């Protein structure tokens, strides 16, 4: 006449690992590393800006691709492989620093620097940057000599940040296909453009010479930039080979930027993004993408790590 104690079990448990052996069968376990991606930019609730064909730095200078994006405003900014920062071939010096800035900017608000000038042409244009016919960077101006080979008045321009936030100033240098046609543009002689705020000093020389054709042309503008701080001044001492900023840029607030190739989806919420979609998971670890950004589980090397939620499974 007796009583026995015992515990439950089942036909197949789940195998897990312990400090002392590999593959103990437990009643129930649960996964701890996320493997399932969902292939969309889960963007519900957030002010999103898919730049598409506009390059992020293009929002500062304004090639035709970026005309809808010169004063954007976002919680989340998506860059695309097809996007270009440029119309007239060229590049930004110190470029990724500018991107990491813009990505977290929550958008940009433009404002003129007011510049007018005397003794120059201000309206140079190109077949690369097409709007109606040949055009140019919306936010900048090709400054030239009045007539072929004319002297470029040695000029100085200054803008002061009237605001209580720091500005983004961007100028550029025109490297002409030849020293010959450097002259047809900006006149003759050694060409000096010099640029100092007061927390920054530096100066620039053009660099004419052959380059292979890109958008048809063999010339390059290389854009430069510095963050001007409140009640600071920036002075532009220059002689030619200059593309001049019409408007400065100010940053709106906070955001996060990502790079991706999958569709926006406003039915989905998510805070962990990678280029192939969104990691929706409450699990501590993930094996999807080690460069995921946002608020993510930790990337681990392991495909799987099972956590026991029941006792040892002993059957007969």
């Amino acid at each position: 006449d007796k009583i026995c104690l015992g515990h439950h079990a089942v036909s197949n448990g789940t195998k897990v690992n312990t400090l002392t052996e590999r593959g103990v069968e437990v009643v129930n376990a649960t996964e701890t590393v996320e493997r399932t991606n969902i292939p969309r930019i889960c963007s519900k609730g957030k002010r999103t800006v898919d730049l598409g064909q506009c390059g992020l730095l293009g929002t500062i200078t304004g090639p035709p691709q970026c005309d809808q994006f010169l004063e954007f405003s976002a919680d989340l900014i998506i860059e695309r492989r097809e996007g270009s920062d440029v119309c007239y071939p060229g590049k930004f010096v110190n470029e990724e620093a500018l991107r990491q800035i813009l990505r977290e900017s929550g958008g940009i608000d433009k404002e003129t620097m007011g510049f007018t000038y005397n003794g120059i042409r201000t309206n140079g244009v190109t077949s690369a940057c097409k709007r109606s016919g040949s055009s140019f960077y919306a936010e900048m101006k090709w400054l030239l000599s009045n007539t072929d080979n004319a002297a470029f008045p040695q000029m100085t321009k200054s803008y002061k940040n009237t605001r209580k936030s720091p500005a983004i100033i961007v100028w550029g240098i025109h490297h002409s296909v030849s020293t010959a046609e450097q002259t047809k543009l900006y006149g003759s002689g050694n060409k000096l453009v010099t640029v100092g705020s007061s927390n920054y000093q530096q100066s620039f020389v053009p660099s004419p010479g052959a380059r292979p054709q890109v958008n048809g042309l063999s010339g390059r503008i290389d854009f430069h930039w510095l963050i001007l701080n409140p009640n600071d001044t920036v002075t532009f001492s220059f002689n030619g080979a200059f593309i001049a900023p019409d408007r400065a840029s100010f940053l709106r607030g906070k955001s996060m930027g990502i790079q991706s190739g999958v569709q926006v989806d406003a039915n989905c919420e998510g805070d962990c993004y990678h280029s192939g979609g969104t990691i929706i998971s409450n699990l501590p670890f993930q094996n999807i993408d080690s460069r995921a950004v946002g608020k993510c589980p930790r990337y681990v090397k392991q495909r799987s790590l099972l956590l026991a939620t029941g006792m040892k499974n002993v059957p007969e």
Partner: protein, 171 residues
């Protein structure tokens, strides 16, 4: 696996138990039966749940790019970035493999603990009226009908009232 009960002196468990984790199976006058001990079961599940809320949990720490999938950054800073990411990756892969190995050893043994806690608490009620069978049962040396079994299952059973019957029934 520690504490000696599960996969131990209690040789294998019960697929027939679907009401909980730990149970009693009696055999008396009317015959066999079975019933699951809620409170011991609930202590295990509640403790496992504690762990599950510890780890199915939310870092709110935001990280951003310093890196670039479309226009690779210059290669010296790239290599330092990749070197740093991979070192940090090694750390978290070590921590993960170790954390869950550690809690799995604690989980398994935690359950075994709750049985030894149950065994040697009914033996404490049954005082001198029963004996250790060896493999997880008590030979109750006196008759305990289906009402005196619910007596032990819900921690009521008075041993003195069956004391004297049992003492020389054993001899």
């Amino acid at each position: 696996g520690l504490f000696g009960a599960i996969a131990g002196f209690i040789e294998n468990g019960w697929e027939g138990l679907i009401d909980g984790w730990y149970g009693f199976r009696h055999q008396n006058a009317q015959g066999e039966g079975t019933a699951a001990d809620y409170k011991s079961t609930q202590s295990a599940i509640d403790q496992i749940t504690g762990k599950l809320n510890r780890l199915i949990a939310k870092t709110n720490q935001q990280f951003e790019l310093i890196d670039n999938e479309f226009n690779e950054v210059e290669k010296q800073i790239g290599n330092v970035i990749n070197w740093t990411r991979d070192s940090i990756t090694e750390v978290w892969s070590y921590n993960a493999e170790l954390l869950i190995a550690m809690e799995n050893q604690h989980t398994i043994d935690l359950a075994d603990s709750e049985m030894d806690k149950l065994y040697e608490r009914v033996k404490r009620q049954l005082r001198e009226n029963a004996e250790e069978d060896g493999t997880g049962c008590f030979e109750i040396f006196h008759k305990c009908d289906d009402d005196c079994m619910a007596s032990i299952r819900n921690n009521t059973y008075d041993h003195r009232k069956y004391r004297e019957e049992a003492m020389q029934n054993r001899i």
